[PDB]
């Protein structure tokens, strides 16, 4: 109630720092907290915002809506106003909030709000019904099973899919806690990652070539002559990096800063190049801002990125638009890559479908020396269009070859970088196996006794998701059936019942989450976790800027920080082993004496590379010990860019702006290494789909929707806007199928069947479509194939299928806008 006013924060309101929960950008926010029955005055010095609400505010004065406010109820029963607003003086966002960040207040836990279905206690499926259980019963059952599996099968029987990421449901405390548990204690290799079905990297090729994927600053996007966005929709997917850094460059606001840095270098008007089969909102908005003459949309054929980059690499080499002194001093393998990667512009154009003039123009803008003699400063930004593209490893090989030859790493205004997805916050022991293992396939084939989903939901986000759900629901059913013959069994008897069920095909499933989710259809056990603001949390953004998000409120019920869940599990296991007289096995579960999340930070991030530390892989590096929570507090939302170079009381944390500025790469010899990039067409499994069925089933992000819609599903505005996952279709394709906006279609192939509401989109090419991924109503991933590259990276953007009209949803027609999301 009350749509037409807001309670201002009092001048003396409490104010903590909070990094945005969601995307890689890591925008800075402030959380104002104050007693419910107090308020600020409208006069600027009588409210905490310092803004004058006695008369209308001018544009850009504030970002403040009711969605940015809430009233929380704490463990003491007392009620507090909260206001979650962007920080004007944070360098990342300069006071910008995205629609996703902007809802943080609404998506904090309250008993009556959008967070009202938060998990507040252990949930147990007791054979035939959901009930609450105690933490100690949950641990006895879960630890008990794990212990039984270790004793009988070894670690190979214990499976996880876990976040490896930063931000909310990740971060340095959390990745350490989980990783220590999985790898040092349990010592299971049967672990996948939240977004991919093995224990691997998105960036094997670029790393192996010596270029870690987050090698620049956001300021580099301000200094660039040319930005490439490759398989990337950054207005929607990395909003405030695009808005606060890219667009000011395209508008000429950063020209004077380029000239001040480089007094004897021409800086033309900045240009942008998109490699994306689809015409996205980002393409449209770039055209609106910069003009059609400063945007090149290389609208490639799906999966032809490798051909594109081999053709551009061939061309820049033949023109001599390369850095020969750089190649000679700082690289290995160039001459070989020229041979293996050779492709003419005509061949490139036939494969990609991009005209030769556009290929030449992209090279001219990006690599041909400026009048003043210097190569253009070209930042090459890529994301999931190529990471989940046609052979992840080969595309990065091709792209990095182009970048290295043109010296577009290590110079300011350059970088070949991930745009990123989540924030980053990785500190973990090494992976304890010697093999990549395709975990979903293992599960489908009936391996494993216990599977834990931790801070992910592969029912909505696996590749080949329908095969996965089928297998897991059936295996879960076997355990359910076995449990319900028990009456009056002790916990230990129940452990034996369940374990026996898993010898007959069953699988015990645990989810550690904020919410039930669709995993509740299969899970036997669900544990409540806590998100940032309910806990302290550290993470870094796409330029490696580490920030502390401060606790300001209690979790719901007995919800706990995931690192502390991991400690709880470890301590339960240790106790069981100690009781069973197994001192060596107990010893593996030592080192989780943690009372708060800070303890996990001290044990992981701050120990990396230190004397008497075990092997630790940390994005903080060996100077991570210089970071403390207190020092990050003093740093504000600006934090420090990792790695930290120095600290003292008078200077604060001093860090690292750009990687590779002296030409020393992360390889044995200090050189960047070129790689061969063969063009082999589409994978046979994908090509088979394309040969059988009509439409390319592209997929990915919507600006407004975050991920699997775990919060968004409970937001009445979001559900009114997107009550179902939508599929962008060409209008002429639509007419042929007798569909229009708000019709429902089935989308289907050999891999599965799913459902979407029709969204006619003039910019979609005939025989192409675009479906929202990961959603709560119509899961896209059912039609993705099982195909992965050499390191088990899926081609999620590589699938084809047919489309069938179900019928017209009149209510969608009455309430959902099918107007264009490409601004002009």
């Amino acid at each position: 109630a009350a749509n037409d006013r807001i309670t201002l924060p009092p001048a003396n309101a409490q104010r903590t720092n909070m990094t945005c929960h969601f995307c890689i950008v890591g925008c800075g926010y402030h959380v104002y907290k104050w007693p419910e029955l107090q308020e600020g005055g409208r006069a600027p010095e009588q409210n905490a915002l310092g803004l004058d609400f006695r008369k209308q505010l001018p544009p850009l004065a504030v970002t403040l809506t009711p969605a940015m406010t809430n009233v929380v109820t704490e463990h003491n029963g007392r009620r507090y106003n909260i206001m979650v607003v962007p920080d004007k003086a944070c360098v990342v966002n300069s006071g910008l909030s995205s629609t996703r960040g902007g809802k943080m207040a609404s998506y904090m836990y309250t008993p009556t709000g959008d967070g009202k279905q938060r998990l507040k206690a252990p949930r147990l499926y007791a054979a035939d019904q959901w009930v609450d259980t105690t933490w100690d019963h949950a641990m006895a059952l879960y630890a008990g099973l794990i212990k039984k599996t270790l004793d009988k099968d070894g670690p190979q029987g214990v499976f996880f899919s876990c976040f490896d990421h930063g931000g909310a449901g990740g971060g340095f405390e959390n990745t350490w806690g989980t990783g220590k548990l999985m790898f040092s204690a349990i010592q299971t290799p049967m672990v996948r990652i939240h977004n991919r079905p093995a224990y691997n990297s998105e960036c094997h090729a670029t790393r192996e070539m010596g270029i870690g994927e987050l090698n620049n600053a956001y300021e580099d996007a301000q200094l660039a002559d040319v930005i490439w966005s490759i398989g990337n929709n950054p207005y929607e997917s990395q909003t405030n990096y695009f808005l606060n850094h890219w667009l000011p460059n395209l508008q000429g606001a950063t020209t004077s800063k380029k000239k001040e840095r480089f007094p004897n270098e021409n800086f033309p008007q900045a240009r942008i190049i998109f490699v994306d089969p689809r015409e996205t909102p980002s393409v449209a908005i770039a055209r609106h801002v910069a003009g059609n003459d400063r945007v090149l949309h290389l609208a490639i054929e799906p999966g032809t990125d490798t051909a594109l980059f081999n053709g551009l690499f061939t061309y820049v080499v033949e023109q001599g638009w390369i850095d020969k002194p750089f190649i000679e001093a700082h690289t290995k393998g160039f001459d070989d890559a020229v041979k293996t990667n050779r492709l003419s512009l005509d061949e490139c154009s036939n494969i990609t479908g991009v005209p030769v003039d556009m290929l030449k123009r992209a090279a001219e803008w990006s690599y041909k020396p400026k009048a003043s003699g210097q190569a253009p400063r070209t930042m090459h930004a890529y994301e999931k269009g190529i990471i989940w593209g046609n052979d992840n490893y080969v595309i990065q090989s091709a792209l990095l070859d182009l970048v290295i030859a043109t010296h577009n790493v290590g110079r300011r205004g350059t970088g070949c970088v991930r745009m990123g997805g989540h924030q980053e916050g990785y500190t973990r022991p090494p992976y304890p196996g010697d093999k990549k293992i395709y975990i979903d396939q293992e599960l489908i084939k009936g391996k494993g006794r216990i599977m834990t989903w931790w801070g992910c939901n592969n029912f909505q986000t696996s590749n080949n998701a329908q095969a996965l759900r089928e297998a897991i629901l059936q295996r879960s059913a076997i355990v359910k059936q076995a449990m319900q013959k028990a009456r009056g069994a002790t916990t230990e008897e129940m452990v034996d019942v369940i374990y026996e069920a898993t010898q007959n095909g069953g699988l015990f499933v645990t989810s550690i989450n904020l919410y039930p989710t669709k995993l509740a259809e299969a899970a036997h056990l669900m544990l409540p976790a806590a998100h940032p603001g309910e806990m302290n949390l550290t993470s870094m953004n796409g330029e490696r800027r580490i920030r502390l998000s401060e606790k300001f409120m209690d979790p719901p019920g007995t919800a706990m920080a995931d690192c502390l869940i991991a400690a709880r599990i470890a301590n339960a296991l240790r106790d069981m082993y100690q009781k069973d007289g197994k001192a060596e096995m107990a010893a593996q579960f030592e080192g989780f004496d943690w009372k708060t999340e800070e303890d996990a930070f001290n044990d992981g991030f701050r120990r990396a590379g230190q004397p008497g530390a075990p092997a630790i892989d940390s994005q903080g590096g060996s100077t991570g010990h210089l970071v403390t929570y207190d020092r990050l507090r003093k740093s504000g939302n600006n934090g420090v860019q990792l790695p930290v170079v120095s600290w003292d009381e008078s200077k604060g944390l001093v860090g690292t702006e750009m990687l590779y500025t002296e030409g020393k790469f992360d390889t044995d010899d200090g050189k960047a290494h070129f790689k061969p990039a063969p063009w082999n067409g589409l994978p046979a499994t994908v090509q088979q789909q394309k040969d059988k069925y009509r439409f390319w089933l592209n997929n990915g992000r919507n600006n407004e929707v975050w991920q699997t819609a775990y919060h968004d599903q409970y937001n009445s505005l979001m559900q009114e806007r997107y009550p179902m996952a939508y599929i962008e279709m060409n209008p002429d394709d639509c007419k042929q199928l007798d569909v229009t906006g708000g019709d429902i279609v089935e989308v289907y192939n050999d891999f599965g069947s799913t459902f979407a509401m029709v969204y006619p989109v003039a910019e979609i090419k005939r025989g192409q479509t675009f479906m929202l991924f990961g959603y709560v109503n119509g899961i896209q991933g059912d039609v993705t194939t099982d195909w992965t590259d050499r390191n088990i990276i899926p081609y999620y953007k590589g699938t084809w299928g047919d489309i069938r009209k179900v019928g017209s949803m009149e209510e969608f027609k009455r309430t959902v806008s099918f107007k264009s999301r490409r601004f002009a």
């Binding site: 009350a2 749509n3 037409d4 006013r5 807001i6 201002l8 409208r42 609400f53 006695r54 008369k55 209308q56 505010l57 001018p58 544009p59 850009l60 004065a61 504030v62 970002t63 403040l64 809506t65 009711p66 969605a67 940015m68 910008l96 909030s97 995205s98 629609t99 902007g102 809802k103 609404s106 207005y235 909003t239 808005l243 909102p281 908005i285 609106h288 600006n703 407004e704 505005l717 009114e720 806007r721 009455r814 309430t815 959902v816 806008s817 107007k819 264009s820 999301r821 601004f823």
Partner: protein, 135 residues
């Protein structure tokens, strides 16, 4: 003391029959610092007023960061030049795409058949850059 509602003014905008289909009229509501548009859409919509139940009215300040939006007659949307938010005039200010976390505020119109008058009498939603719709 007591009152839970804001004291909205009653401000005459026009008579309904003076509005042409898809030709926006400008006015201020609830004071001269709050620019608004009323438009006859030409086809009935939920909550439209006037003889053809098709007249709607909005605050034009973007609910993201407050730039005056512009009515596009060809799409019947309000487009913000600041961060490219677009609102649907035919779906009660629903955000088509953008960075806002609130729909475009609706100006509530009374339509009197007796006089043909449209009177602004309230706002549904919070106008950008205001503690309350009524300052």
């Amino acid at each position: 003391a007591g009152r839970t509602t804001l004291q909205y003014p009653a401000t005459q905008v026009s008579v309904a029959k003076n509005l042409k289909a898809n030709e926006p009229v400008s006015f201020t509501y609830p004071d001269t610092s709050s620019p608004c548009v009323a438009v006859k859409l030409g086809s009935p919509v939920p909550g439209g007023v006037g003889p053809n139940n098709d007249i709607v009215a909005y605050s034009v300040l973007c609910t993201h960061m407050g730039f005056p939006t512009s009515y596009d007659k060809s799409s019947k949307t309000f487009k913000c030049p600041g961060h490219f938010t677009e609102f649907d005039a035919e779906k009660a200010g629903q955000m088509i795409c953008g960075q806002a976390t609130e729909n475009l505020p609706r100006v509530l119109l009374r339509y009197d058949e007796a006089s043909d008058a449209l009177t602004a009498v309230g706002v549904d939603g919070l106008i950008y850059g205001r503690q309350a719709n009524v300052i």
